[PDB]
Design a protein around this nucleic acid. Structure first.
Ligand SMILES: [Ca+2]
Ligand SMILES: [Ca+2]
Ligand SMILES: [Zn+2]
Ligand SMILES: [Zn+2]
Lengths: 344, 548, 547, 345
DNA sequence: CACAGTGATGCAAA
DNA sequence: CACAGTGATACAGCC
DNA sequence: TTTGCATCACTGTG
DNA sequence: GGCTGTATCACTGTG
């Protein structure tokens, strides 16, 4: 694991905590800028290009059938297989949550120019409430695909919301939601094995299982070291969902997950306590039924990274993590973060 | 002997801090031997009645999503925003009242004025008829606010203030509504009551929305509701009409969902491109509103007609964002004056260089033109050069004497005539969008406004086409197009300007320096309380006790 | 009913303007029916006594080139400077008191203090023996003073202030001098009496000389003379000793004829060069003086020995200009602290990046080191970044907690002990030049100062060699060489510091906008009069009437 | 007469009103900077190089025998024929007048690098008092050369100077001083024709006559339109000086004088009243006995020059005047003056 | 070791 | 047509 | 019950 | 006659 310093061009101000990175056929794209889209880039989706350890963000245009999405600040993102991306939830710049599913695909690709198609899909049934910090993955079973969505943060319900505590948040219920994208339907399931809500957790999608590890519960203000496995069976009848708690979990909130090789993943960074920052890395290997996590070598963090109070990042899809660190020099200066790239 | 309320009034009006007042009180007591001034604890006990969260009140029907308690004072402006390390970073110190308590405090301060107006209007002073309080809202963003050492967030070096002013109260007494209170000096800092003080950037949309969402929620809650409040015996009922017109152009653009300042779409009242405005210059109508902005944002997001980016931007005219504050489309008199002054300054620079027959000039010659203009202005009109443009420079620049002085630098004479005519037209049009009652102060000027606007536009398109051909300034467009319509709609432009908030910024700086605790976690609270006390008619009435 | 003097004292010391005081007076009178306070004209009549130009006085022998009149108040600082179009341009506004009149007013305002002091030491109150007074002189140059509109010269956006404070008064009784007054807060703004206010650039030698020449002429007249005044109904005789010490390094270099800013010659007290200072660091003697500088300038102009430019510069030791203000060789106790703090800040930045092991680095890397230091200092010591070093930042930075906080950014442990030793030595040396009476306030620290200085220099030459081999800073040289001798000469370093004038600049800025007419033809005189009133012990005594 | 702007390099701030320019064999040099000499240029003299309408000031070094003279701010300077310059009076940066004569010559010039030699000449006899704004010329007669110095402006005497009026100035007496540079002696003569003092006047040096025209008398605050001719005869015995008043003078204070051809001078610049600035130019034609003053064409002044309250300048020695006007704007700016070159055919 | 505030809070004194 | 000062001066009014 | 004074982390002029 | 109140002058600052 190697750490390099990346210099960013003239649109640094467009990168804020909670951004999303997408990978399309080896091309990296950026979504979730700070502030509403400007005239230079109306879409808000940029082409995240790193070359000779320098980062450039050039605008990308949508198609005629597309819908222009707001910049979401903590959405739930998954890859669906042509290769498309599903983004649900999030927080708009006006600080109000979204309950819309957006699907991003590539319409036409030219020489170093890509046009996207963002289609809005409306859910019916027991639709999940608006939330941010949750997780969504895709499960394949018996030749059919479905989506698994877990809990996160949300504002208080409209019947118990007071202005003096307008921005207060509470963990959503630990219900598990199955989403059928082909018909746009959603069904909710209550699992007795899950009792406390979780936010800012990590989800790994095997063929027909979803592993939920890490998290933060606002009810008790703890970061449990619990690992859950959710299995979905999709017969001709109604779907069935089962949950099993497994030993060997880790306590981490807001970790960055990447896929190095087949049946292998790397969890880098996150938080252990409020003032303690998780400086160790974990390696997750999945088998047919059993998985095991372990501690890998700690990358040579620089002096600034160790002593930073906060840090945020995203995955670039090729065994590389793009992670920032505040510079605390926003007074009459243009550089507010000290982004780094980490190779596994 | 002297009463605690009077002592507090003297202290808060003669810019005295608690320490200085303690020194004065101690010395007077020691020398005279008799306690003339009341002590500090007596003053701070007397200051509780004036602050919010003291008087009982009721809302019918009760406000949605607003607590029914009537004992809330200064509360945190973050409104429970999460500060955990996992969520979005928060670097902001904000303190605010509650919008339903500030209003009752203001009304209880104005109780005597309301009763006096009722008596002077030949109405019985026991009616509980539903009053209609008009309140003007202003939001301003100050820069160069130095931060403090110590524990706390890395707060930026900028501040944002949200304030309100009670303008007019009317009571229905049959077939007509009669006035019981009208503010005599609407643009003064004495009547501009602070509501929220935060230390965050005006362009930081996320933080601004997170802090100002609760206030807008309360305001929308109390648009359809009635307030019952006991005012000198009888309980009386109040309604409210909110008119936010104290915002500047940049802030209106940011909060109404419109695009940045530099764009094809210039006016925040109509939907006209810069080229169309330059070609028409006179005839336009107000066709913009908060609801229309919301609908156009929905169209932009949904893209129902399957249009390209350019066609969609034409369809939804500049609304690339979702609005979150409802503002009345109007013109800020102060900033309109400043912008017109800047435009005229540049016109003078161009004219003293003869650009009407020399289209191209070097970058090193325009600086010389500006230097000559600055030297001559200092020599004649006693104006030093300044970096930006402020109101006093505008007032001393838009006189005919300035044009006479400048004309000595213009070789030609037809240019003298053109510039003089332009200045005369501008001075004839200005007192319409600057007076507090044009129908009773400048009626001839108001009536002869369309004719003067047409003459001004014709002169601009004919004898100044080297700068105004395909490009016109936003303030010129507003002044030439929408002023008569805004006057007809409201009653006065200028009584609704940002002058009150801009004047209150000076008080904010003075209080933050020498009337508030210097700690990083108390300064905003102290400044808010002292500013609210300063803007109190009950205390200000004592300072006018000599004449009665 | 209060007296006019008491009302004036309340108004002046509570930072009230005349308009606000009129509002208060009107309201109190209207609401009580009785005239508790006094009107503005009464206060203005009462303020005549406390200003220069009231009390009669005499000089024997009469001052040369100074008018004998005793009724001069605020006078034009230009002193009849030619404003014709043919002459040199004049673009400044200045107002000043006559030095003798100002000193008469200052002495008369502390009449009760002098009498109480002489009663407190078993001396008769009617003694007329020669009182020797010592005065401290400060000149400071402010910046970012906004210019006003209106008719008048295109004045610059800078100001220059001249001030004096009465330090001590002694009377010769028998065979020894007994102190009848010693100022308890010398660096306070409450005793920093102004003398001349001008709107001119500090580095504008023509204007500065043209405006400050008359004051220096008056001072030179006063040096050899004897004042006769009347106190307590008895004639008293006074002599004066002037000491200019509030000057900063730049101003003393500009005004004493020395070469400006950095050069081979770094110290304003001795003739050492930068290389010699970096090689010796502890052993030097004070040699510079005003007469010596005059002789050096004469040698520079005449070139008696027919030497080239370099040899002549070596001979004259950096005196390329003619001095015009006599300043004693001393070290300011505020700018020294600021400079030492800046040097330690740079040391911390270099030590973070391990420059002792890596001789070379890039600009981006140095900026990153500074950013890391700033972030960690905000986290631990609660210090925000500032553009230029100031006193509070220096005081919080020079603590051992700061070194402990920076210790966890330095990887090598061997550097931790070196840095801690350096900070401990600095903190053991600082109170000697910061205290107001080292003999009675830090005797051990004063006694073992040479040992600490030698250890500090050894540490600089051995451990931190990468920055102090061939180059040492002026303030480090002064603090390691001259302080044991300056204290033996004078008595304290902190007492004779620019702190009073710097604090008075704040009052100047406040008064220029809250207690002065907002016109270019009146603001300076208004500020001068109000400042002189604010620094009056007769008025300040009323506020301490409870105790 | 052609007027053209000239831009200055990084030492622009060194130029202040009252500077002097000297001409040595076609090279132009600059003396009288603002502030005391810095480390870059200890001497204070510079090479006033104008090429492609751009001005550069390169430092110049004195010789080993030289005296490093202070920057004088309004000196009386004359040429003396090797070719040397005589500087008398002036104001030092500390605002104190000087009573020293400095003779400047060229010691060695190899290739665009000139070294000077400045010698201080002691003055004995009826030595003139320290002054500034006066005039000194050199007269040749019967194979002997002397110098004629006329009155200027000085401070009050030491017995009548008060600190409240320390910087007040008065015109010196209208005495005429003959200075012999070979022996360094001075002799004062009182001429009944000269009754009032003059400061900032123009002196033309013919064979054995000095023409004094223009001036400003502080006693009456007027600018008289008088022309005086001073004829000096140097026989074997005591020198004789006569003065004659001639009609045809002009009223101008602080004018700039240059020489175009043999016996032909041009006067440009100066002031007529306090708020009125002399925008016309005069031509002086010299002869064996009589002189003629005429009005020549008015140069095409720019807008900024016409409306400037003050202006200053000097002579570059080749029918070229280097003048300057203030720029007013001086806050956070490096350009404080605008400089023009005026060529007279 | 600058010094006079900056205000609310709490406890001792009358 | 911003508005409440910024202070000294001069003149009218009151005890 | 009503006054008076010390305490807390900070300011500004550099 | 002395004391007191008020208007006037060219400017400020927050933009
Ligand atoms: Ca503003
Ligand atoms: Ca200073
Ligand atoms: Zn419009
Ligand atoms: Zn030394």
């Amino acid at each position: 694991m190697s750490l390099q310093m990346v210099t960013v061009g003239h649109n640094i101000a467009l990168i804020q905590p909670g951004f999303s990175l997408m990978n399309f056929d080896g091309q990296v794209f950026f979504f979730g800028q700070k502030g509403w889209p400007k005239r230079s880039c109306p879409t808000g989706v940029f082409h995240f290009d790193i070359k000779q350890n320098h980062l450039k963000l050039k605008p990308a245009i949508f198609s005629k059938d597309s819908c222009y999405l707001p910049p979401l600040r903590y959405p739930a993102t998954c890859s669906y297989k042509k290769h498309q991306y599903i983004i649900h939830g999030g927080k708009t710049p006006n600080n109000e949550l979204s309950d819309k599913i957006y699907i991003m695909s590539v319409a036409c690709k030219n020489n170093k120019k890509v046009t996207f198609r963002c289609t809005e899909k409306d859910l019916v049934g027991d639709v999940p409430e608006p939330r941010y910090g949750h997780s969504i993955d895709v499960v394949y079973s018996r030749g059919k695909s479905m989506g698994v969505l877990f809990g996160g943060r949300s504002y208080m319900p409209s019947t118990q919301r007071t202005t003096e505590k307008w921005n207060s948040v509470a963990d959503c219920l630990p219900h598990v939601f199955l989403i059928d994208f082909e018909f746009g339907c959603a069904t909710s399931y209550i699992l007795p094995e899950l009792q406390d809500g979780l936010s800012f957790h990590v989800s790994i999608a095997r063929n027909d299982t979803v592993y939920i590890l890490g998290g933060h519960s606002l009810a008790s203000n703890i970061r449990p070291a619990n690992l859950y496995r959710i299995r979905v069976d999709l017969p001709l009848g109604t779907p069935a969902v089962n949950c099993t708690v497994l030993p060997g979990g880790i306590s981490v909130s807001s970790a960055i997950l990447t896929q190095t090789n087949n049946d292998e993943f790397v969890i880098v960074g996150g938080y252990q306590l409020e003032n303690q920052k998780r400086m160790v890395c974990s390696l997750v290997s999945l088998g047919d039924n059993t998985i095991e996590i372990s501690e890998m070598e700690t990358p040579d963090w620089t002096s600034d990274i160790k002593h930073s109070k906060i840090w945020f990042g995203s995955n670039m899809g090729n065994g590389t993590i793009f992670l920032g660190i505040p510079g605390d020099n926003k007074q009459a200066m243009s550089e507010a973060f000290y982004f780094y790239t980490l190779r596994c | 002997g002297l009463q605690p309320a009077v002592c507090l009034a003297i202290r808060v009006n003669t810019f005295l801090s608690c320490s200085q007042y303690h020194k004065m009180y101690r010395t007077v007591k020691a020398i005279t031997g008799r306690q003339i001034f009341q002590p500090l604890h007596a003053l701070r006990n007397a200051e509780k009645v004036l602050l919010p969260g003291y008087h009982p009140f009721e809302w019918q029907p009760p406000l949605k999503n607003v607590s029914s308690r009537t004992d809330v004072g200064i509360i945190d402006g973050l409104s429970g925003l999460a500060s955990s390390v996992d969520e979005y970073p928060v670097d902001t110190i904000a303190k605010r009242f509650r919008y339903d308590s500030a209003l009752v405090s203001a009304l209880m301060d104005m109780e005597e004025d309301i009763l006096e107006g009722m008596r002077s209007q030949d109405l019985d002073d026991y009616l509980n008829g539903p009053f209609t309080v008009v309140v003007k809202e202003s939001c301003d963003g100050m820069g160069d606010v130095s931060e403090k050492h110590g524990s706390g967030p890395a707060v930026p070096e900028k501040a944002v203030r949200f304030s309100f002013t009670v303008m007019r109260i009317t009571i229905e007494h049959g077939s007509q509504n009669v006035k019981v209170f009208e503010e005599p000096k609407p643009n003064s800092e004495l009547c501009c009551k602070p509501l929220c003080l935060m230390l965050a950037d005006e362009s930081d949309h996320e933080t601004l929305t997170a802090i100002l969402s609760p206030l807008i929620a309360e305001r929308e809650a109390m648009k359809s509701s009635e307030l019952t409040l006991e005012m000198g015996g009888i309980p009386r009922t109040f309604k409210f009409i909110f008119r936010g017109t104290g915002y500047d152009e940049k802030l209106v653009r940011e909060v109404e969902g419109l695009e940045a300042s530099g764009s094809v779409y210039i006016c925040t009242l109509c939907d006209t491109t810069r080229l169309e405005a330059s070609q028409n210059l006179v005839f336009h109508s107000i066709t913009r509103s908060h609801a229309e902005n919301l609908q156009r944002y929905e169209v932009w997001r949904s893209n129902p007609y399957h249009e390209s980016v350019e066609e969609l931007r034409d369809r939804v005219k500049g609304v690339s964002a979702k609005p979150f504050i409802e503002t009345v489309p109007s013109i800020d008199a102060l900033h309109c004056d400043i912008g017109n002054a800047a435009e005229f300054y540049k016109i003078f620079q161009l004219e003293i260089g003869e650009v009407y027959k020399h289209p191209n000039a070097s970058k090193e010659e325009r600086k010389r033109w500006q230097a000559t203009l600055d030297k001559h202005l200092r020599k004649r009109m006693n104006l030093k050069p300044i970096m930006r443009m402020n109101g006093n420079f505008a007032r001393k620049l838009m006189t005919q004497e300035t044009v006479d002085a400048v004309c000595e630098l213009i070789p030609s004479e037809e240019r003298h005539e053109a510039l003089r005519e332009l200045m005369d037209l501008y001075l004839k049009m200005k007192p319409v969008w600057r007076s507090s009652c044009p129908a009773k102060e400048c009626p001839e000027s108001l009536c002869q406004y369309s004719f003067n606007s047409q003459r001004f536009a014709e002169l601009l398109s004919t004898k100044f086409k080297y700068r105004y051909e395909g490009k016109i300034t936003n303030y010129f467009h507003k002044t030439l197009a929408h002023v008569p319509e805004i006057i007809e709609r409201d009653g006065s432009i200028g009584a609704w300007a940002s002058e009150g908030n801009e004047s209150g910024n000076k008080l904010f700086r003075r209080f933050r320096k020498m009337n508030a605790r210097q700690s990083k976690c108390y300064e905003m609270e102290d400044v808010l309380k002292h500013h609210w006390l300063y803007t109190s008619k009950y205390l200000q009435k004592f300072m006018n006790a000599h004449n009665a």
